[PDB]
């Protein structure tokens, strides 16, 4: 629910924008963006 | 079919890096860009003929 800095971890660890990341060793490696409201399938 | 073929002929590279003139001018210096664009010009003229 909050932006995570590069090579960092979530600070506070429900309703609002969600920022998605790829984690390798508990640290943010790639930023994927916000979750769009119209996701219908993930392959 | 004739119009369809004429329209689809615009995707031919004609031995160039790209079929988009804007991409060529955004990726290359003008001296090389002109040489790249000349091939597309010739191919499109042949298709029109």
């Amino acid at each position: 629910n909050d932006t995570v800095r590069e090579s960092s971890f979530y600070s506070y660890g429900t309703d609002g924008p969600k920022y998605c990341y790829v984690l390798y060793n508990g640290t943010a490696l790639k930023y994927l963006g916000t979750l769009p409201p119209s996701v219908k399938e993930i392959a | 079919q004739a119009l369809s073929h004429l329209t689809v002929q615009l995707q031919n590279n004609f031995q160039a890096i790209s079929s988009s003139i804007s991409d060529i001018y955004n990726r290359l210096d003008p001296p090389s860009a002109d040489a790249q664009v000349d091939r597309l010009i010739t191919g499109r003229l042949t298709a029109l003929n």
Partner: protein, 98 residues
Amino acid sequence: PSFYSHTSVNITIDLGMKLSGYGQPIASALSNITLPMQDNNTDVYCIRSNQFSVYVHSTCKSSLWDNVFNSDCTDVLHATAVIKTGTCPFSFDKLNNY
């Protein structure tokens, strides 16, 4: 969307010039190219950030038919380093064009 991380790549080109017997400036093949230091070396540089920019810094020196560059280039022997496309599908000056 992506992370923001910018890297500047400075390429240093040291040129050697001389005067030929016909009165024309000749650029020596002993000119040196220096890349930013990476992994304890300065000959290969790979981009490891999301965004990058490229810059060229040129220096000029002169010798007298002895490959001993110890004097600054004069008005006749002054030269500037440039990078041309060659065989690449893109030019160096267009690398900063997204």
